[PDB]
Design a protein around this ligand. Structure first.
Ligand SMILES: N[C@@H](CCCC[NH3+])C(=O)O
Ligand SMILES: N[C@@H](CCCC[NH3+])C(=O)O
Lengths: 486, 486
């Protein structure tokens, strides 16, 4: 309440005094151990050992908790790898430090300590300090909606062990993805974030202006088209992990800027990539989580049993059994069905979009276990190769875990004449009402004209993947600094 | 001249015919070797061996060159890892293929081939084809200012072996940087690209608007301030490799969006990072280039001899020996010197800026061998810890190789009261004429108030590093898709 402004004014005056005494913010203390290391190597030893071993250490961290017992105290110190106990004794430190200084410090303050190890009555490992000092004065006290954890992630990180575990694991996932890709000869590239024409996905984009060149640019909604140019140029196995910016809304399972991986391999089809995705997940879970059966909320995600495969038509029939599939071949009856399950059909929608929507509604949520849905109507797949036997559908697949879309992949359209026509279609839909349709891209049609080998491309939502790997149930739990509404 | 439009119209009609015959863009051919692999494992064998070994292969690539010799031909095929020879014989292929098809294909076309290996009269390894077919029709012919190589990098990549070598090595550098960092316990993070207030460097930024939140955002000129928040939160060894966007101009050694690495380690100072940089380069060169002495243009960069260390004052005196250092302590005389060497002094400049400028001019170009310049006036170092003995300078360093700045690092300012005052300074300079000054950042002052441990941070220009590693002499040689003027 008002506790805070007193805390501020006290911590304030304490610093102005520290300045008069000398150098308030020293940067010469050097530690040599972190809690996790100390615990790891020494929690298996007893006090008869330690006293005789006489192993001295130096550590630094944030003073979390301090139990003052007159002429001796106990402080809990928290560093990058955990918390460690300190026994602070007035006579075992230099003269005056414990009284004129230590007792005058505050919780939140960063300290440095050095002393021999031992174990307290409780069995906890501790450092009997011979030296201890203030490194950084916390002008503000430790912490105390749940959106506070997102406006000031450092506070959350200091407090919540799980967050720090979550992100540590995120790094392990990326590191493991890269290790995996390179092992299959994929080379990582960096294409532009700014683009003169945005594309490679369906989304309203962010506009920016290059002051100098008098030119509007765009934050990339996807790097797809540039990565395919690299395949034209002869990089036959490229992948890229980085942002995309979609001017959508901050609806919790969304963030305006997220992390995606795209990978392309020439002389392969969507199947080759379906099978690649399997190994990616099944291998990462095993390596990063030890087990193949993985707990996510109420369910146990079985990454060990072969991922399920259904075509869209199959999925529609499986989750809406009363469905007369024959109605899905006709426009009026398919619109009837779509509206009978409560979908508002846009004026710009054609049959394939309607069917795709119906699938979205009736089935997506039920795909809890790792699932691949295949064979999408051409309409909704502007960059995908047509199917040989049925041109009305494309060699395309989506991938779902936990009722969410974790992946997307297809046999690439390298038919430039067709690719250009699908752009005109996308441009028509845009004029017709679709704020998410694609822009026509001449330079790309051209790149294709020079020849794009047959190729299969795969996109994967890195954030959502981490969620399923760390048991997070909002994307804001896997993004260090989510975009917060003012 | 007009050759092109004939080539187009011919390649056009050839495709319309292919469509009538069947599926023009097949995606079922599967290769099993790349040129580099074939050359690597088989260029050490003679023809008496090969004929008896009878090793069959399948490959695919772009038809680069075709010497038609009547009832037999030779084609050069180029894939991700090089070129490989094909012996195409009318009778050794299925009936009709060589005449009704092969001879009707074009250069640029992507093909797939299968056949037994052997060696021609010249000693070159080749594939005596039993099967060969068209995968992708090149509706446009192969290639033929030098800016063409940048407007259509796929063309350049197809033609120029060195480009493809350059980028392959870039990947190796990044991969090696990450390997290096993680080996020292650094954890990689991803902070925002969009930011409500831009900062962490001096540069005019790119503005964008989030349509929904009615809020202007900015492309990050640097991620510095967010990475330091992570150190407040307890990640004591973080690093991040990703873009920065500076609304500068496309002046060849610049690109509006480039790749930077930042790394922070708590309980360390600028020295600890100077020494880290040494190992980074010396180790990468050795690993990636085999040698420590490395050729760059006219000079041999000696990464083996200990990097040179000079303070700015030292450097000024070394490259302008007639300089009376005493004049550098006074404002009018230091401005006199600056203007006597042809520097226009801005109305908003103070002594430290003037001296820094003088250094820039007189010395930067001469720093050819790996060099660290230390001790920068406070004025030009808004986020750096003051020096204990001399508050007028900061514990800061720049790093130079080849007359260019490859690095930047300092002991971090964790004095919130001072940090806020330096912002007011930056805000003053901005109002006074500096299009590159910093914005005031409240949320950051606050993060510091909660306490930032003593820390040292290091920034490194990844692109410029690659240049020096691949002998490129423009940044546009290390960026797959440089920003080209319309
Ligand atoms: N660009 C796609 C991912 C790759 C699709 C296959 N070419 C997306 O944003 O979903
Ligand atoms: N943010 C700096 C790099 C890190 C400086 C040390 N904290 C730059 O853009 O040059």
């Amino acid at each position: 309440v008002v506790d805070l402004n007193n805390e501020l004014k006290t911590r304030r005056e304490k610093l102005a005094n520290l300045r008069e005494q000398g150098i308030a913010f020293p940067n010469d203390f050097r530690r040599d151990h972190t809690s996790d290391q100390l615990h790891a190597e020494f929690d298996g030893k007893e006090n008869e050992e330690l006293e005789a071993l006489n192993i001295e250490v130096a550590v630094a961290g944030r003073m979390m908790t301090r139990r003052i017992m007159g002429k001796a105290s106990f402080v809990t110190l928290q560093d990058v790898g955990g918390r460690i106990q300190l026994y602070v004794a007035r006579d075992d430190l230099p003269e005056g430090v414990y009284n004129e200084q230590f007792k005058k410090w505050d919780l939140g303050d960063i300290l440095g300590a050095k002393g021999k190890l031992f174990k307290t009555k409780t069995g906890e490992l501790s450092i009997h300090c011979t030296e201890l000092r203030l490194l950084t004065k916390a002008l503000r006290p430790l912490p105390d909606d749940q959106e506070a954890r997102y406006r000031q992630r450092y506070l959350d990180l200091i407090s919540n062990d799980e967050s720090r575990n979550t992100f540590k694991v995120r790094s392990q996932i990326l590191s493991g993805i890269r290790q995996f890709m390179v092992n299959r000869g994929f080379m990582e590239v960096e294409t532009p974030m700014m683009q003169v024409i945005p594309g490679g996905a369906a989304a309203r984009p962010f506009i920016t202006h290059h002051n100098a060149l008098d030119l509007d640019m765009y934050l990339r909604i996807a790097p797809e088209l540039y990565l395919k140019r690299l395949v034209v140029g002869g990089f036959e196995r490229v992948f890229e992990i980085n942002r995309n910016f979609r001017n959508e809304g901050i609806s919790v399972r969304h963030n305006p800027e997220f992390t995606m991986m795209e990978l392309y391999m020439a002389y392969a089809d969507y199947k080759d990539l379906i099978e690649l995705t399997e190994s990616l997940f099944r291998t990462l879970a095993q390596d990063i989580l030890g087990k193949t059966e993985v707990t996510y909320g109420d369910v146990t995600l079985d990454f060990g049993k072969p991922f399920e495969k259904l075509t869209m038509r199959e999925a529609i029939k499986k989750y809406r059994p009363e469905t007369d599939m024959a109605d899905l071949d006709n426009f009026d009856s398919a619109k009837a069905i779509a509206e009978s399950i409560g979908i508002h059909v846009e004026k710009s929608w054609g049959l394939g979009r309607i069917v795709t929507e119906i699938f979205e509604e009736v089935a997506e949520a039920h795909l809890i276990q790792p699932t691949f849905i295949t064979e999408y109507p051409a309409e909704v797949s502007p960059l995908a190769r047509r199917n040989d036997v049925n041109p009305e559908i494309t060699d395309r697949f989506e991938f779902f875990i936990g009722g969410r879309e974790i992946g997307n992949g297809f046999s690439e359209l390298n038919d430039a004449e067709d690719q250009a026509q699908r752009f005109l279609d996308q441009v028509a839909a845009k004029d017709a009402g679709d704020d998410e349709a694609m822009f026509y891209d001449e330079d790309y049609v051209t790149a294709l004209e020079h020849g794009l080998p047959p190729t299969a491309g795969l996109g994967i939502g890195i954030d959502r993947m981490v969620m399923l790997f760390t048991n997070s149930h909002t994307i804001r739990d896997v993004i260090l600094f989510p975009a917060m509404r003012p």
